Amino acid sequence: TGIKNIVYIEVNDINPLNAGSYIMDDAPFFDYVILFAANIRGVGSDATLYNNPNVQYILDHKDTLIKPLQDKGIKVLLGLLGDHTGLGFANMNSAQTEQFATAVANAVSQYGLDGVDFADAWAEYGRNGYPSGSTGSFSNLITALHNKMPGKTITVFNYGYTSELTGVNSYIDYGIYAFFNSPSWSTGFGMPNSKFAPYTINLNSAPSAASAQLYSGQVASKGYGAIGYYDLRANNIVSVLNGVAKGAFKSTCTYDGNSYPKNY
Amino acid sequence: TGIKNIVYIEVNDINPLNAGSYIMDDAPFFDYVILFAANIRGVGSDATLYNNPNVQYILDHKDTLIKPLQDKGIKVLLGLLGDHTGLGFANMNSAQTEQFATAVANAVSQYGLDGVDFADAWAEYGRNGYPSGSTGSFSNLITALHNKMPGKTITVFNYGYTSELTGVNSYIDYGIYAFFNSPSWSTGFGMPNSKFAPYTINLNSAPSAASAQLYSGQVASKGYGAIGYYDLRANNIVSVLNGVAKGAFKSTCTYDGNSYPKNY
Ligand SMILES: CC(=O)N[C@@H]1[C@@H](O)[C@H](O[C@@H]2O[C@H](CO)[C@@H](O[C@@H]3O[C@H](CO[C@H]4O[C@H](CO[C@H]5O[C@H](CO)[C@@H](O)[C@H](O)[C@@H]5O[C@H]5O[C@H](CO)[C@@H](O)[C@H](O)[C@@H]5O)[C@@H](O)[C@H](O[C@H]5O[C@H](CO)[C@@H](O)[C@H](O)[C@@H]5O[C@H]5O[C@H](CO)[C@@H](O)[C@H](O)[C@@H]5O)[C@@H]4O)[C@@H](O)[C@H](O[C@H]4O[C@H](CO)[C@@H](O)[C@H](O)[C@@H]4O[C@H]4O[C@H](CO)[C@@H](O)[C@H](O)[C@@H]4O[C@H]4O[C@H](CO)[C@@H](O)[C@H](O)[C@@H]4O)[C@@H]3O)[C@H](O)[C@H]2NC(C)=O)[C@@H](CO)O[C@H]1O
Ligand SMILES: CC(=O)N[C@@H]1[C@@H](O)[C@H](O[C@@H]2O[C@H](CO)[C@@H](O[C@@H]3O[C@H](CO[C@H]4O[C@H](CO[C@H]5O[C@H](CO)[C@@H](O)[C@H](O)[C@@H]5O[C@H]5O[C@H](CO)[C@@H](O)[C@H](O)[C@@H]5O)[C@@H](O)[C@H](O[C@H]5O[C@H](CO)[C@@H](O)[C@H](O)[C@@H]5O[C@H]5O[C@H](CO)[C@@H](O)[C@H](O)[C@@H]5O)[C@@H]4O)[C@@H](O)[C@H](O[C@H]4O[C@H](CO)[C@@H](O)[C@H](O)[C@@H]4O[C@H]4O[C@H](CO)[C@@H](O)[C@H](O)[C@@H]4O[C@H]4O[C@H](CO)[C@@H](O)[C@H](O)[C@@H]4O)[C@@H]3O)[C@H](O)[C@H]2NC(C)=O)[C@@H](CO)O[C@H]1O
C-alpha cells in the first residue's frame, strides 16, 4: 500500500475535525486519526477504561465530532494511555487483561470507532500496590483485542514495554517512532519497514517545510509504510504537510478552509 | 556487491559437497548452496518441519557434509518446500506460523546453517481440511523467522504466493526466477535488480556454454545481483560455469577434481 499518514490529536485542546481539513489527490491527507487519549486506570483489583471529560464528550457526540471524519474515509482510533495509577498495559494479571480488553472492545463497538492505539506511557508502574515489573500482559492484551475486534485496526506508539510485542506483531497494523522531527531508520518490536513510521512530526512545534520534504522523501525511498504526526492544532499547518506531500508522495497538500474550534 | 551464484542441490540424489569443487578467482564459484529440501507438513493442527532421510542424514553429519563447504566461505541454507499435506507457507494461522518459524530457527541454530530458502510449491493447499486459500501467513512467516535468526540469510524462489511478499522484501536477501535456461528481465515482489536472479540455469539438463555466456553477460550489464542454478550433479559441469564466468565475471571457472558420491 501507499504510505499512510497517522495523526495523534490532543483532544484536551483540539477539535478532531481539523484532521479532515487537509486534502491530497482528492482524498484526505490523513489516513488515521487517534483521539489522544482514553486511559487505563487501576481501581482496586479492577482494570478500568477511563475517559476524561473531553474524550467522553467526543464519544458522546460521535455523530458530530467523529462521523464526518469517517464519512471522508478517515479511520478514527481511540488512543490509550497510562494515567499514574500504577497499573498499565504491561503489568496486569490474567483477569485484569480480560477485563480491560472487554472494556476497550465494547467502547470501540459502542462508539463506531475503527480501532485503537496503544501508548505505554505515564502508568507509573508499581504505585498503589500493583506490580512494579512486567507480567507479560502487554502481548496477551493485543492478542485478546485481536480476537475480540476482528476487522479493526491496532496501532502501537513505540514507547514503553513495546520490545515485548515482537511475537504478536502480526496483529499490529502500524508502529510509530516516539521522538519528533528527526527520523530514526529502524523499527520496533520486529516490525517490517512497510508497517512502521520511522519519522514523526510534531505539528505544534513544527519543523520547516524544507526539513519535512527532505525527510519525507527519505521515508519513501527507504521503503517505509507510514509517517507519524503529533499535536495537530486548529491553525492551518498545510505549509508543513505540503512539504511531506512533495517529498513522500510527489504530490501537493491543500487546505479546505475549515478551522474547527473546541467549544466544549 | 558483486553477482552471487546461488545453487539448489537435490540432496535426494547428490552429495552437496560437489558445490565446493568449482573455483573462480581463487574463491568458491558458488556463494550460496541450498539443501533442497526440508518440508512443511501439517499434522492435525500442528505445522511441522519434516526432514526426509537424506536431508536428516546430511544434518546429522554436518561435520563431514556441511562444514567443509562453510570452511571455504560458502553459505549453506536449508531449503523449505511444501509436501502435499494441504498446509503450506501461505495458509497457516498465527499459532502455526509461530510454531513453524520456531522449528526452522531451531534447526538453523542446531545444525550451524547460514539461513533458509523458501519454495512455495507442492503444498496442495486445501487438502486434508486446511484452508484452500491464502491467510496472509507467508509474509508473517518471513517476519517471524527474520526476527528469530538475526544475521542469517533468507532467499525466496519466485514461485507460489510470492506476489504477497512486497511488504517484507527488506527481510529477503535474494529472489530467484523460477524457470530454467532462459532469462526473464524483471523481478518479483518489488525487489530491486541488485537483489534478484533473473536467470536460472538447470545444470542437469544443461544449456550450451555459448548460451550461458550470452545470457550471463546480459545479467551483469543490466545490473542484476545474482544468478541461480538448479540440480547440480556429480559430473564435472565446469564447461557451463566457465561460460558464466566469462560472461558475468570476465574471468574463468575451473574444477578442483573432487567428485563426491552419495554413499548414503
Ligand atoms: C519529559 C519528557 O519530555 N518526556 C517525553 C514525553 O513527554 C514523550 O511523550 C510523548 O510526547 C508528548 C509530548 O511530549 C506527550 O504529551 C505530553 O505529556 C505530558 C505529560 O502528561 C502526562 O502527565 C500529566 C501530568 O500528570 C500529573 O499531574 C496531573 C495534573 O496535576 C494529575 O492529574 C496526574 O494524575 C499526575 O499527577 C499525579 O502524578 C504526579 C507525578 O507522579 C504526582 O506528583 C501527583 O501528586 C499525582 O499523583 C497528565 O495531566 C497527562 O494526562 C492528561 O492528558 C492526557 C492526554 O495527553 C489524557 O489522556 C489524560 O486523561 C489527562 O487529561 C485529563 O486530565 C488533565 C489533568 O487533570 C486535564 O488537564 C485534562 O483536560 C483531562 O481532563 C499525562 O498523563 C504533558 O505535560 C504535555 O502537555 C503539554 O502539551 C499538551 C499538548 O500540546 C497541552 O495540552 C498541555 O497543556 C501541555 O502544554 C504545555 O506544554 C506544551 C508543549 O510545549 C505547550 O504548547 C503549552 O503552552 C504548555 O507549555 C507550558 O508548560 C510547559 C510544561 O508544562 C512548559 O515547558 C512551557 O514553557 C509552558 O510553560 C503533553 O501532553 C505524550 O504523552 C507522548 N505522546 C504519545 C504517547 O503519543 C515521550 C515520547 O515522545 O518521550 C519522553 O522523553
Ligand atoms: C509439471 C512441471 O514441469 N512443473 C514445474 C515444477 O516442477 C517446477 O518446480 C521446480 O523445478 C524442479 C524441477 O522441475 C522441481 O523439482 C521436481 O519436482 C517434481 C515433483 O516433486 C514433488 O512431488 C513429488 C511427487 O510426490 C507425490 O508422490 C510421492 C511418491 O509417491 C509421494 O511421497 C508424495 O507424497 C506425492 O504423493 C501424494 O500426492 C499425490 C499427488 O496429489 C497423490 O497422488 C499421492 O497419492 C500422494 O497423496 C515428490 O516426491 C517430491 O518430494 C520429494 O522431493 C523433494 C525434493 O525435490 C523433498 O523435499 C521431499 O521430501 C521428497 O523427497 C523424499 O520423498 C521421495 C518420495 O517418497 C523420496 O524418493 C526421497 O528420497 C525423499 O525421501 C515433491 O514434493 C519431481 O518429480 C522431480 O523429481 C525428478 O527430478 C529429480 C531431480 O533431478 C530426481 O531426483 C527425481 O527422481 C525425478 O527424476 C526424474 O526426472 C528427472 C528430471 O527432473 C530425470 O533426470 C530423472 O531421470 C527422472 O526421470 C524419470 O521420471 C520422469 C517423471 O518423473 C520421466 O519424465 C523420465 O522419463 C524418467 O522416467 C523434481 O524433483 C522443484 O520442486 C522446483 N524447484 C524449486 C527450486 O522449487 C516449477 C518451477 O520451476 O515449474 C513447474 O512448471
Author numbering:
A (entry chain A), B (entry chain B): 43 to 79, 80A, 81 to 201, 202A, 203 to 225, 226A, 227 to 306
Authors' account:
B. thetaiotaomicron contains almost 300 different GHs belonging to 60 different GH families, and secretes at least six mannosyl-glycoprotein endo-β-N-acetylglucosaminidases (ENGases, endoglycosidase hereafter) that hydrolyze the chitobiose core of asparagine-linked, or N-linked, glycans (EC 3.2.1.96). Here, we discover an ENGase from the GH18 family in B. thetaiotaomicron, BT1285, encoded in a distinct PUL with its own repertoire of proteins for catabolism of the same HM N-glycan substrate as that of BT3987. Altogether, our data suggest that human gut microbes employ evolutionary strategies to express distinct ENGases in order to optimally metabolize the same N-glycan substrate in the gastroinstestinal tract.
To better understand the molecular mechanism by which BT1285 specifically hydrolyzes N-glycans, we solved the crystal structure of a catalytically inactive variant of BT1285 (BT1285D161A-E163A; hereafter BT1285i) in complex with the Man9GlcNAc2 substrate at 1.9 Å resolution. We found one molecule of the Man9GlcNAc2 substrate unambiguously positioned in the active site of the enzyme flanked by the following connecting regions: β1–α1 (loop 1; residues 52–57), β2–α2 (beta hairpin; residues 78-94), β4–α3 (loop 2; residues 123–135), β5–α4 (loop 3; residues 161-178), β6–β7 (loop 4; residues 199–204), β7– β8 (loop 5; residues 218–240), β8–α5 (loop 6; residues 243-250), β9–α6 (loop 7; residues 272–282). For example, Man (−5) forms hydrogen bonds with residues E166 and R169 in BT1285 while it is exposed to solvent in BT3987, and Man (−9) is exposed to the solvent in BT1285, but it is in close contact with residue N403 in BT3987, These observations are consistent with the degrees of flexibility displayed by Mannoses within the crystal structures of both ENGases bound to HM-N-glycan, as evidenced by the B-factor values. To further investigate how BT1285 specifically recognizes HM substrates at the molecular level and how it compares to other HM-processing ENGases such as BT3987, we performed an alanine scanning mutagenesis analysis of residues that decorate the β-barrel core of the enzyme and contact the Man9GlcNAc2 N-linked glycan substrate. E52A from loop 1, H126A from loop 2, and E166 from loop3 drastically reduced the hydrolytic activity against IgG of the enzyme (at 37 °C, pH 7.4). Simultaneous mutation of two non-catalytic residues, Glu52 and His126, both of which engage the N-glycan core, completely abolished BT1285 hydrolytic activity, indicating that together these two residues are essential for HM substrate recognition.
